[PDB]
DNA sequence: TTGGATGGTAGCG
DNA sequence: TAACGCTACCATCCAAC
C-alpha cells in the first residue's frame, strides 16, 4: 500500500497572493466578517507571515488586530478559491483513478498501482508538485506513506511547500515517539481523556485494557488508535459523496421575534437549494445559537422529497419548536439539507 | 429486543 | 468577541414484534 496525500499550502491566503503578488512576503489574514458590527467575525486563515504573531484560523478578528495590526486584512471571497481548488483537483485525478477529495485543499491518491517503491513515489510527488505550480501557480505540500493517516502526517511534517515519505521503520518510531494529540481525529477533548489513562502515544494504547479505553473515549475511536498503533490502519482511498448542504448566519440583532428571523431563515434556505442543484433532500434541520452561545437543533425527515416552497414551511415550524422549546434570544440561525435521493 | 430518527458532541477544513 | 461548512459518532428513545 501507498499512499501520496496532497495539502495546498495556506490556501486562501495564497490565492490570494498569486491574485495580488505584492502581498507576498507581508502578512495577510483572510476574514470572515459577520455583519454584527465593525471587525466582527473570526479569521478563516492567514499566510506564514502573520502566523508568526499568533495570527491563525478562528480567532475573533478584533484579536487578531491587537497583535497584528500591520497585515492586509481581506474579505474570504470562497467561490474564488473554490475555483482554483476545482481545477486543482482535475489535474490530481490525471495521476490515479483512485483519489478521494477530503476538502477545498486535500486529496488522497491511491498509487499503489502507479509506482513500485518509495523512491518512485517521492519522484511523483515532485512532478506533481510542479505541475501544479506550473500550471496555478500555487505551492502544495505532499505526504507519502503506507496509509492515508500517515500520509497526512508526513505532510503536517513538512509544511509548507514540502514533500516527506514516512516508511515503514519511521511510521514504528512515530507510534512509539508522535504526541498522540497530533494524529488525525484527536482534539483537545480526546487528548485531556487519553492523558487521565496515562496515554500520551500512540504505543500507550497497546497496553490499555479495551474496554477501559471504550468507555472513556467510545468504541470507534478506541478502534481507530489501537489499529493504527498495531501497524494496521489499511482504510481505502474511496470517492467521497456530499451527505449534507446548509447555511449559517449572524443576525444583526439578537432575537426571539419570528418575523424577525424568518428572512434570514429564508435566505439560508434559498442559498442551500441552490447549492443542491438537482439533488433532492429528505430531510431538514433548523439550528440556532443562543444569546449564551449554546445550540440548539430541530429537524424532521419525511418518506420522500422536500421542495423549496415545502422547505420555507416546513423550516419555519421548527423554528418555532425551538422558540417554543428554548426561553433564550437567538443570535444565530441556520438550515441543513440531507438525506438525499 | 432493535433500529431509524433525534439532537447533541468532537474534530476539522 | 468568539465564522461557517462539513463528516463521523454517540446516547437515547419509541414504535415494530
Ligand atoms: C482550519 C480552517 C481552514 N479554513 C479554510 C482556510 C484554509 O486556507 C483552508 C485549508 O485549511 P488548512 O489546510 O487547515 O490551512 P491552510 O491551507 O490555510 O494552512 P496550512 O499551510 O497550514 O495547510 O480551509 C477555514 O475556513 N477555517 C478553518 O478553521
Ligand atoms: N457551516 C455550517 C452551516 C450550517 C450548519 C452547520 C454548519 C451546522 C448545522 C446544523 C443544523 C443546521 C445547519 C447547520
Ligand atoms: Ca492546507
Ligand atoms: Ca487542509
Ligand atoms: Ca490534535
Same mark, same amino acid.
Given at each position: 500500500g501507498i499512499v501520496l496525500f496532497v495539502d495546498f499550502d495556506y490556501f486562501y491566503a495564497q490565492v490570494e497572493e498569486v491574485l495580488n503578488p505584492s502581498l507576498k512576503g507581508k502578512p495577510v489574514v483572510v476574514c470572515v466578517f459577520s455583519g454584527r458590527f465593525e471587525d466582527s467575525g473570526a479569521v478563516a486563515t492567514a499566510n506564514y507571515e502573520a502566523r508568526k504573531f499568533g495570527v491563525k484560523a478562528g480567532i475573533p478578528i478584533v484579536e487578531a488586530k491587537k497583535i497584528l495590526p500591520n497585515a492586509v486584512y481581506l474579505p474570504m471571497r470562497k467561490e474564488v478559491y473554490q475555483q482554483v481548488s476545482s481545477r486543482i483537483m482535475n489535474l490530481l485525478?490525471?495521476?490515479?483513478? /483512485?483519489?478521494?477529495? +477530503?476538502?477545498?485543499?486535500? +486529496?488522497?491518491?491511491?498509487?499503489?498501482?502507479?509506482?513500485?517503491?518509495?523512491?518512485? +513515489?517521492? &519522484?511523483?510527488?515532485?512532478?506533481?508538485? &510542479? /505541475?501544479?505550480?506550473?500550471?496555478?501557480?500555487?505551492?502544495?505540500?505532499?505526504?507519502?506513506? #503506507? &496509509? #492515508?493517516?500517515? +500520509?497526512?502526517?508526513?505532510?503536517?511534517?513538512?509544511?509548507? &511547500?514540502?514533500? /516527506?515519505?514516512?516508511?515503514?521503520?519511521?511510521?514504528?518510531?512515530?507510534?512509539?515517539?508522535?504526541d498522540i494529540a497530533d494524529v488525525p481525529g484527536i482534539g483537545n477533548i480526546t487528548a485531556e481523556k487519553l492523558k487521565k489513562l496515562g496515554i500520551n502515544k500512540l504505543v500507550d494504547t497497546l497496553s490499555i485494557e479495551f474496554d477501559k479505553l471504550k468507555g472513556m473515549i467510545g468504541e470507534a475511536k478506541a478502534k481507530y488508535l489501537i489499529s493504527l498503533a498495531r501497524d494496521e490502519y489499511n482504510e481505502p482511498i474511496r470517492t467521497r459523496v456530499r451527505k449534507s448542504i446548509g447555511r449559517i448566519v449572524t443576525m444583526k440583532r439578537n432575537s426571539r421575534n419570528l418575523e424577525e428571523i424568518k428572512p434570514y431563515l429564508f435566505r439560508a434556505i434559498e442559498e442551500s437549494y441552490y447549492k443542491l442543484d438537482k439533488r433532492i433532500p429528505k430531510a431538514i434541520h433548523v439550528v440556532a445559537v443562543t444569546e449564551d452561545l449554546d445550540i440548539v437543533s430541530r429537524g424532521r425527515t419525511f418518506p420522500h422529497g422536500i421542495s423549496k416552497e415545502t422547505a420555507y414551511s416546513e423550516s419555519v415550524k421548527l423554528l418555532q419548536k425551538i422558540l417554543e422549546e428554548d426561553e433564550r434570544k437567538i443570535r444565530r440561525i441556520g438550515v441543513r439539507f440531507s438525506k438525499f435521493i
Open positions: 485525478r490525471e495521476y490515479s483513478e /483512485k483519489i478521494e477529495i +477530503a476538502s477545498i485543499d486535500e +486529496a488522497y491518491l491511491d498509487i499503489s498501482d502507479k509506482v513500485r517503491d518509495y523512491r518512485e +513515489a517521492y &519522484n511523483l510527488g515532485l512532478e506533481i508538485k &510542479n /505541475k501544479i505550480l506550473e500550471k496555478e501557480k500555487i505551492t502544495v505540500t505532499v505526504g507519502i506513506s #503506507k &496509509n #492515508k493517516v500517515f +500520509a497526512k502526517i508526513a505532510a503536517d511534517m513538512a509544511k509548507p &511547500n514540502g514533500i /516527506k515519505v514516512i516508511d515503514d521503520e519511521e511510521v514504528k518510531r512515530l507510534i512509539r515517539e508522535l
